[PDB]
Design a protein around this nucleic acid. Structure first.
Ligand SMILES: [Mg+2]
Ligand SMILES: [Zn+2]
Lengths: 226, 16, 427, 63, 633, 249, 226
RNA sequence: UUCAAAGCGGAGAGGUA
């Protein structure tokens, strides 16, 4: 009963990904419930990875400047925060950056371990002049949703680390539409078409599978316990 | 005048 | 406070129906059920105003398609008037009146056409639906969005003979923006300066009448005043039933058809009894009042009557002076304070026939408020004119002005007479 | 125990009174007496506040 | 103020082109403060003038040095408005022309006019000249919008409007914060604090940029560069810009997706419902810098010393001091934290007392500057003082429930809800909206220009165009604004390829779905791009509470003021309201136990804490003060 | 939650001393200052059943001060019910309000019994109602209960009682504005009605079925009424069922 | 990990059933997803039994009244359309009614086969008075949702069997609400309260179990393939 | 046994509802 297949797949210049799926046959009004459940779970309840803290060599607050660098610290923290990254291990990882001389520092200059990988090695991070160097350390983490800074992480072990508001959202747009696929007698059958845009951390197929697995675990405790 | 001194006003619940 | 089953209202529900339903619920069920009913209605309205998707656009502002021809006709009349003025046929104080009256009548015609157009083409229009239902809009505001702004006034009280012939949908010109800013500034300064006067008046009222507290039950009198409806001659403004609620009768009232009594002495009047008194004739009822009660430096419970917030006789030790002062003073800041149009009535005959006026009515030559000359009539006489198929049975009034004299040819919808509808002659 | 039930009970107490300002004083006296008599360290239904307790008791006495 | 009346606060027919008829305050100052118009100037006698072009035989001479004329001069002439249309910058078209003769409005043939105004915006000021589609607005809401445009807050990353009016680049060049190159050369060194430009063998030009300074009202005054190293630069080109300007021009707000429809009661009576994207995308966030000061003086008992040896304090409260008693740069300070440690020589062993300065309650942020001044170093100080210490603390504020938002057309509002992005209504492509506004507020106040602005912003976003429209644009056609907006929307629909963008049955409306259930609303609604501003009235500065604090000296009543733990005043109108209710015990408790019954306050507090009954009050102190004052007479 | 912990301090201290035995007042104040989790658990049960008085700046009549029951919210703004705005003359574009609390038993009983916002139905200047749906609720009721010549799917369908019609509309099978016949034994009030009976059909057995424009009463021979039907709209059924359910429950 | 509990469980005036459930703790936004997905399926996608066709003898045409009966055809057709029946077989059945005498006819007089059970045994259908005979024949079928015939009203006459619009819904009303269960100063927590009204054919706990069983099988095939 | 060191009046200008 009912099949799901993929019609289109693409990849943009930011290394994002797009996918279109066709699910049919449904039964007269079951298109909307399935589609909206999928859209609500995909846009809200998925786990991702983000940069949560960064130490810059020579500064201690966000309203400072480094000589020879075209950007201030506040304008670098807002570029590092948008660095999309995908970790295989379930642990915090630390990446290191050290650039010197006339260059444009780019996300290809950050070197994590053999576990974490960068998705877009053309992200822009600051511009350097002749005789200025940049040293940075980044810390990545797992999570879900939007996490604000709480000023209670005053641990002395993590000394002189600047904290950021973290955003873990691997899916950026979902759309769906239900069409009539009447075979011809009277049966009034449905067909759902679903479009997913991701940021490159995970394929649209993996995102769809994760959402469908979360929904089943949501609706299974009510199956026979009641 | 009871307001100025700080007494119960002769109207309402302070009638009697 | 129960047992009264609601009626199935099979009709549309605007603000007046909601107010009526709330009043009925309070009168029949009490003060704790009205809150529940109001909360349920609020929830239902909030829920179903969102499913509708009510919005506002530029094409929702529908202008009638006959505006251009109306403006063209008005401008042709204005040109005729000014050409008459240039040749010396009329004086300067008549040209102003003519050009003011033309633009005062055109605006009324345009407003009628706008209102008729809304209710026929799109009766579920968002602007029409939200102005007719009583939610926020008005008629002086719908007029300025899709109709015509009209004649405005100087920074003094004078009138500028140049009208505004555009709405806010089409867009004003540089000249009309200034004329509008005049009145905008006048209103702003009025609002700024009214608050101090209102506050001072309320303070004086509170201090004059602070010691009026209810101490007695009855002074035992037989005096009162006569309550009657408030009428402006032919028309009534406030009916007697609205003025007779909560009062106490000082003498037994009687139906003017027989000897059936409707109330005894010393009896408060509810809504049912007020309606019963109003329906069965009767133009005056004698009631008690704080004006005529002889108590010790206050009022008594029987002379005051009901307390309107509770629909009951007043309690003992209630400060009625503070309430009276606050009630008079609260609407003080809401006292926000073109010529003969439809306040007269032109008589146009929709027939083509010869004139049979003769010399029956008293026709004295007269020069009207415009430059024209007509015949002024004071003797009420029924007009007789040969109106093609059959004669005329038209009736004039005292002080009327007739334009048509004998030996003329009247055509379809030609102006025939003017009748004043029912006095300060200034210099 | 609901707030709506308390509202209905207070409205019923207001009626059957003949004076609006005389019932508030009686309720206050009853509430003060109840709270004072609670001084015995047994905590007899201390969950309810004294004014609501007085309203409930006077409504029950109304039969 | 008591002598000015109705005649001085009015508009005179001689203000035309010299004083703006819109921009004024509301309240006691309405009509008593005014603003100079756009083209007016004052001569050496002290009279305001305004320019005109000459008209010869019905031909406008736009090449003959416009003449400036005062109010009395232009009373015998017939002067035409600035919106009259000419065919080749020459002969005046039409057959009847509006003119002003002796403070009256008439119409004449266009062979009999004398002068013509320079521009259609010659009558309004600079703040009112920045409102597009102004001729479709009421005058009161125009006043509101012009007044509210001057209370906006500079944001973290500014952005230009899409439907600007054309005067933005000129309103920003006078504040002196934009840097333009005088060189027509090359750029050799760019940095966050320095720019250098080299000419064609014409030496070097170097500029230094201000960084995170502070204004009179505690707002940032940053300056940032635009250019990159080795860039070809022409004369008069923008090189760096300030904190409230995009490249060259003013930028006070942001462009967001708007829909006009009611939500489930959250739009009620001017309330605003927004999305959660505006919070985590750092839209509408700003930086505010505060300054604190402490003074070390000398006393007859002795001098005062600034040191970290404060009595009755533990080492758990001296972590961030620099062994000299002054906090360190880059420290996070929460409420009740020591900034500078001071001791005074009291007379009473240890004879010193601690009154070091701490941050006021409700303040936090980073320490960014600790500049300090002292004698024996070349610094002038007020007499009797030894040193002065100034500390600067900065913080970043986000939009939240209770903040005020505004638009250019007079529409104000307070934010009441922040919805997660899956609850917001969405478009036929899956894009959730940013803000939902109530349509009940448009027709009763007559701001029709905001809908024009929204539709043109929608078209501009879909085309990437950034249109510019000048006020009073209907001298060229019968309905110019509607035709331009419709043509732009149709062109955007044809260029994009998506048919749902524009519909012919309902031009400005498209279909919108429900994010909670997935069902479409019954009728299409109006969506667009709106330019909204964030005002200086934030809810973090309006909340206050008190239980017990300082009292006045003479009357023994609680002090008043947010900054000194003040109480709320219970005026006499509220006393009248409580008297009308029949209340006797609430009033007596307010008047005595909670205000100035000097002995009943402590008894009431102790009775409440212990759980007993509150005892009866006595006579308040103000009555005794009045009796003493009357006896002294 | 930031104003309640300040206005209600002595009651919190008393409850902390009596239950959850602390010791003295200084320890309770240090506990409040430290922001222990127990503080909010104590406060939530301290403030229930305690009225609070709310006031707005130009108090023009006695309905400018009213008593409410508080609920702890998160944020820094006071939430006000939409049905009390015209009494206060309030509006959500910058307005501010002041909060006072009563201390003694008499003040509490008197605020509950004389000033509570749920017993202020009529106005003292004139006996007209003062708490009515005003702006966006009247628009919703007007839309729900209006009529639409288009969009009339399912017109002319017979239902038994009003709940059946509501259930048929809830799962989409009839429009919100269609004309349907329902069975309703009660009192009806139609607009544009014909008070004179119409289409009287004297059927067999002396049974008479009079057909009006909006009713189909069927009466027995010189006797009582046998049945009644009303021609109406599903939105009107919703409105009237809501009112009746609120009144009967 | 959440728990579901049954708070209240009543029984209406001998036919209907009422049930209220509380489900907690859920994430933020999951309450609306679960509630709406359950509501749609409960109200629109459960099977049931209803009366579809009926034949009445002695109709006395040119009117609609039946001799000797207080009611007419329309009233009896609306009375018999609310009968609540429950069948244990997937094949349609046939029922007969041959009451007589001065009595009140109820649902207990219908002689259905052993495979059909009447829920309410006293459901008013008519009142026979002194010398009239009532003959009836009813047909029962299986289906889902609210049906509707085309171009056929209720008070009419068709060939032999008269068709009706059946109500196959076993569930009459469903309500849900979402409340806060934060308990502290941490991530928001949802609680869902769900009320179900049933006509007596099923308990309000078998309806929930059936809805969950139907929802699990919709989302399961979207997990192991794509 | 004692408490205890943080509160102050006036004038002018502008703003919000
Ligand atoms: Mg306001
Ligand atoms: Zn008397």
């Amino acid at each position: 009963t009912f099949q799901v297949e993929c019609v289109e797949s693409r990849t943009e210049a930011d290394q994002g990904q797009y996918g279109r799926f066709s699910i049919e046959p449904l039964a007269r009004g079951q298109g909307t419930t399935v589609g909206n459940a999928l859209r609500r779970v995909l846009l809200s309840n998925l786990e991702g990875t983000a940069v949560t803290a960064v130490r810059i060599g020579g500064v201690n607050h966000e309203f400072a400047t480094i000589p020879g660098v075209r950007e201030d610290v506040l304008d670098i923290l807002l570029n590092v925060r948008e660095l999309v990254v995908h970790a295989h291990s379930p642990q915090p990882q630390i990446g290191r950056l050290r650039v010197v001389g006339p260059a444009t520092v780019t996300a290809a200059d950050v070197d994590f371990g053999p576990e974490v990988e960068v998705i877009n090695p053309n992200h822009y991070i600051a511009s350097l002049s002749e005789g200025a160097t940049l040293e940075m350390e980044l810390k990545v983490e797992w999570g879900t949703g939007y996490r604000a800074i709480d000023r209670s992480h005053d641990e002395t072990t993590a000394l002189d680390f600047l904290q950021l508001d973290a955003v873990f959202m691997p899916v950026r747009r979902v759309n769906y539409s239900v069409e009539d696929a009447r075979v011809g007698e009277s049966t009034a059958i449905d067909r759902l078409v679903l479009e997913v845009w991701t940021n490159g951390s995970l394929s649209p197929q993996e995102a769809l599978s994760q959402a469908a697995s979360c929904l089943v675990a949501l609706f299974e405790p009510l199956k026979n316990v009641s | 005048e009871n307001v100025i001194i700080g007494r119960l006003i002769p109207a309402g619940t302070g009638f009697k | 406070e129960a047992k009264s089953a609601p009626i199935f209202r099979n009709r549309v529900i605007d603000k007046k129906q909601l107010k009526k339903l709330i009043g009925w619920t309070f009168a029949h069920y009490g003060t704790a059920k009205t809150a529940v009913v109001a909360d349920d209605l609020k929830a239902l309205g909030f829920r179903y105003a969102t499913r509708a998707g009510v919005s506002i656009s530029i094409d929702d502002l529908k202008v009638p398609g006959s505006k251009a021809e109306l403006l063209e006709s008005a401008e042709k009349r204005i040109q005729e008037t000014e050409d008459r003025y240039t040749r010396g046929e009329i004086t300067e104080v008549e040209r102003f009146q003519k050009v003011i009256d033309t633009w005062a009548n055109t605006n009324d015609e345009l407003t009628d056409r706008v209102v008729k157009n809304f209710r026929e083409s799109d009766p579920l229009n968002s602007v029409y639906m939200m102005a007719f239902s009583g939610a926020r809009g008005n008629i002086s505001q719908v007029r300025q969005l899709v109709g015509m702004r009209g004649l405005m006034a100087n920074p003094q009280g004078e009138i500028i003979d140049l009208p505004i012939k555009t709405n806010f949908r089409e867009g004003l010109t540089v000249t009309e923006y200034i004329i509008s800013s005049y009145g905008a500034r006048k209103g702003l300064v009025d609002t700024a300066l009214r608050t101090a006067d209102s506050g001072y008046l309320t303070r004086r009222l509170v201090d004059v009448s602070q010691d009026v507290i209810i101490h007695e039950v009855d002074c035992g009198t037989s005096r009162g005043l006569f309550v009657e409806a408030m009428t402006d001659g032919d028309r009534i403004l406030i009916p007697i039933s609205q003025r007779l609620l909560g009062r106490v009768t000082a003498e037994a009232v009687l139906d003017p058809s027989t000897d059936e009594v409707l109330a005894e002495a010393g009896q408060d009047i509810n809504e049912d009894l007020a309606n019963r008194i109003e329906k069965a004739g009767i133009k005056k009822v004698k009631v008690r009042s704080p004006l005529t009660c002889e108590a010790a430096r206050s009022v008594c419970q029987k002379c005051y009557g009901w307390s309107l917030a509770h629909a009951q006789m007043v309690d003992m030790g209630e400060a009625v002076g503070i309430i009276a002062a606050q009630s008079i003073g609260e609407p003080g800041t809401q006292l926000t304070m073109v010529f003969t149009g439809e306040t007269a009535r032109l008589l146009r005959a929709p027939v083509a026939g010869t004139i049979k006026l003769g010399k029956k009515a008293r026709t004295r030559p007269y020069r009207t408020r415009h430059g024209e000359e007509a015949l002024l009539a004071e003797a009420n006489f029924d007009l007789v004119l040969e109106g093609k198929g059959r004669k005329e049975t038209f009736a004039i009034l005292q002080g009327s002005t007739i334009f048509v004299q004998d030996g003329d040819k009247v055509a379809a919808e030609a102006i025939l007479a003017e009748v004043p509808v029912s006095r300060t002659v200034e210099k | 125990l609901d707030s709506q039930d308390l509202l209905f009970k207070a409205e019923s107490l207001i009626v059957n009174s003949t004076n609006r300002y005389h019932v508030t004083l009686q309720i206050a006296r009853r509430a003060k007496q109840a709270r004072y008599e609670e001084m015995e360290n047994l905590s007899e239904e201390t969950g309810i506040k004294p004014v609501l307790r007085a309203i409930l008791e006077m409504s029950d006495e109304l039969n | 103020r008591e002598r000015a009346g109705f005649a001085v606060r009015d508009i005179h027919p001689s203000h035309y082109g010299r004083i703006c008829p819109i921009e004024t305050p509301e309240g006691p100052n309405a009509g008593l403060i005014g603003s100079l118009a756009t083209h007016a100037r004052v001569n050496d006698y002290g009279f305001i003038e305004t320019p005109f072009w000459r008209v010869e035989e019905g031909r406008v001479r736009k090449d003959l040095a416009p003449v400036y004329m005062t109010a009395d001069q232009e009373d015998d002439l017939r002067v035409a408005p600035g919106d009259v249309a000419t065919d080749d910058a020459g002969y005046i078209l039409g057959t009847t022309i509006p003119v002003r003769y002796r403070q009256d409005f008439t119409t004449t043939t266009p062979e009999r006019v004398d002068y013509v105004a320079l521009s259609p915006v010659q009558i309004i000021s600079v703040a009112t000249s920045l409102i597009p589609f102004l001729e479709h607005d009421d005058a009161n809401r125009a006043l509101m919008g012009s007044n509210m445009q001057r209370q906006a807050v500079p944001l973290l990353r500014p952005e230009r409007p899409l439907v600007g009016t054309g005067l933005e680049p000129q309103a920003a060049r006078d504040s002196g914060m934009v840097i333009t190159s005088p060189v027509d050369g090359t750029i050799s060194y760019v940095d966050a604090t320095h720019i250098e430009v080299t000419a064609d063998t014409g030496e070097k030009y170097g500029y230094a940029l201000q960084k995170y300074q502070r204004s009179n009202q505690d707002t940032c005054l940053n300056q940032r560069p635009i250019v990159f190293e080795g860039d070809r630069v022409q004369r008069g080109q923008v090189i760096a810009d300030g904190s409230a300007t995009e490249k060259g021009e003013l930028a006070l707000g942001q462009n967001i997706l708007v829909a006009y429809m009611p939500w489930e009661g959250y739009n009620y009576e001017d309330a605003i419902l927004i999305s959660e994207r505006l919070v985590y995308d750092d839209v509408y966030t700003s930086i505010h810098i505060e300054k604190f000061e402490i003074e070390a003086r000398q006393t007859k008992l002795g001098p005062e010393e600034i040191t970290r040896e404060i009595p009755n304090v533990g080492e758990d409260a001296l972590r961030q001091l620099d062994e000299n008693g002054i906090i360190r740069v880059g420290a996070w300070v929460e409420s009740g934290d020591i900034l500078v440690g001071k001791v005074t020589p009291k007379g009473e062993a240890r004879d010193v007392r601690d009154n070091s300065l701490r941050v006021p309650n409700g303040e936090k942020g980073r320490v960014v500057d600790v500049r300090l001044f002292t004698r024996e170093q070349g610094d002038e100080l007020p007499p009797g003082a030894n040193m002065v210490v100034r500390v600067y603390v900065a913080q970043k504020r986000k939009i939240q429930v209770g903040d005020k938002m505004a638009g250019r057309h007079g529409n104000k509002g307070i934010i009441s809800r922040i919805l997660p992005c899956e609850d917001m209504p969405y478009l036929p492509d899956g894009t959730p909206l940013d803000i939902v506004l109530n349509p009940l507020g448009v027709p009763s106040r007559m701001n029709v220009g905001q809908v024009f602005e929204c539709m043109l912003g929608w078209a501009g976003q879909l085309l990437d165009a950034r249109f510019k429209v000048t006020p009073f644009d209907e001298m060229y056609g019968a309905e110019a604004s509607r035709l331009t907006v419709n043509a732009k929307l149709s062109e955007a629909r044809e260029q994009t390829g998506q048919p749902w963008v524009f519909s012919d049955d309902e031009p400005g409306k498209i279909q919108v779905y429900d994010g909670r259930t997935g069902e479409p609303f019954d009728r299409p609604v109006t969506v667009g791009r709106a330019y909204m501003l964030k005002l200086v009235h934030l809810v973090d500065d309006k909340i206050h509470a008190r239980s017990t604090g300082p009292y006045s000296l003479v009357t023994q009543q609680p002090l008043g003021g947010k900054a000194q733990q003040g109480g709320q005043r219970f005026g006499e109108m509220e006393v009248w309201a409580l008297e009308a209710y029949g209340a006797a015990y609430i009033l007596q408790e307010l008047l005595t136990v909670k205000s100035d019954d000097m002995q009943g306050r402590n008894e009431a507090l102790n009775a409440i804490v212990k759980g007993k009954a509150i005892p009866r009050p006595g006579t308040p102190e103000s009555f005794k003060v009045l009796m003493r004052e009357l006896q002294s007479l | 939650r930031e104003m309640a912990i300040e206005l209600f301090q002595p009651f919190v201290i008393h409850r902390l001393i009596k239950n959850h035995s602390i010791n003295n007042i200084k320890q309770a104040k240090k506990l409040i200052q430290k922001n222990d989790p127990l503080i909010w658990d104590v406060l939530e049960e301290v403030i229930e059943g305690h009225p609070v008085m709310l006031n707005r700046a130009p108090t023009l009549h006695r309905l400018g001060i009213q008593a409410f029951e508080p609920i702890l919210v998160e944020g820094r703004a006071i939430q006000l019910h939409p049905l009390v705005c015209p009494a206060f003359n309030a509006d959500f574009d910058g307005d501010q309000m002041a909060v006072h609390v009563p201390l003694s038993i008499e003040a509490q009983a008197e605020a509950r019994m004389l000033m509570l916002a749920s017993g202020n139905i009529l106005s003292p200047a004139t006996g007209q109602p003062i708490v009515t749906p005003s702006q966006d609720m009247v628009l919703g009721c007007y839309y729900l209960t209006a009529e639409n010549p288009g969009a009339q799917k399912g017109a002319g369908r017979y239902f038994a009682n009003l709940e059946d019609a509501i259930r048929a509309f809830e799962q989409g099978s009839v429009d919100l504005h269609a004309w349907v016949w329902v069975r309703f034994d009660g009192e009806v009030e139609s607009e544009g009605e014909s008070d004179e009976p119409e289409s009287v059909v004297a059927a067999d057995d002396g049974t008479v079925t009079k057909t009006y424009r909006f009713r189909r009463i069927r009466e027995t021979e010189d006797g009582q009424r046998l049945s009644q039907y009303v021609k109406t709209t599903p939105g009107r059924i919703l409105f009237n069922n809501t009112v009746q359910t609120a009144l009967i429950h």
